[PDB]
Symmetry: C2
Subunit: 140 residues, 2 copies
């Protein structure tokens, strides 16, 4: 799994077309979302993560939480994201891990949002420019 | 070299603190920049790119130009970017390649902007959500 963490003034998204034939089902009010003062976790779930969804999930929950504590973010937003890896997991593995990660950050105490899986999504972001506002983590 | 290409409604940046002790020198009016309808090329120059700045530059110019032609972007914005690689080049190599890339896209005919090297930078982006609006390329 590779993750890119961005500490943002805001993150907002709008779902556009489906990218999978059978993407994640969504209500009309999950087509758009917005958080402020939020750590956004762009997560690319890799093929090698199939080998251990549980351990990879737990590690990602901790890494993301560490950063959120350090930058004083109470809001965390999980984003399914193809673009940090060229060995992507199957949709079932990816969705499994992304949900685990999401539920774990909620148990940790954060206010957690997530973007639906399997869609092309337009999005707007404002990235803070402090030393810790953009970080990469590799988790395996 | 790894590159992330984002087709954006707009990209805007403001330079914050220096990240290097001796970053790229800048005038007051390069502290902030903005382009609309722009392909933004986030470029992580890697250690392995030291071996051949010229070939790696030429390849990156072509890949970025291919995408710009395909998405009908006339504006291209080059962004120095640590976050797609964990084997980063020395600042001299990185700046060498980023300038080559910048000059090449200008020769190709694009309207090209660039962010200064060596700074923490706040930035705002609006990413189009069409199938080709976010692409990753590895160039070696």
């Amino acid at each position: 799994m590779r993750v890119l963490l961005i500490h943002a003034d805001y993150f907002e998204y709008e779902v556009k077309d489906k990218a999978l034939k059978n993407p994640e089902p969504i209500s009309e009010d999950m087509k758009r979302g917005r958080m402020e003062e939020v750590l956004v976790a762009f997560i690319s779930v890799e093929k090698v993560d199939e080998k251990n969804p549980e351990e990879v999930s737990l590690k990602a929950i901790e890494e993301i939480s560490k950063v959120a504590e350090q930058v004083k973010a109470e809001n965390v937003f999980v984003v399914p994201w193809a673009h940090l890896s060229s060995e992507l997991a199957k949709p079932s593995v990816a969705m499994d891990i992304l949900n685990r990660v999401y539920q774990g950050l909620k148990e940790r105490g954060f206010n957690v949002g997530k973007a639906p899986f399997g869609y092309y999504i337009a999005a707007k972001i404002s990235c803070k420019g402090h030393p810790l506002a953009e970080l990469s983590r590799t988790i395996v």
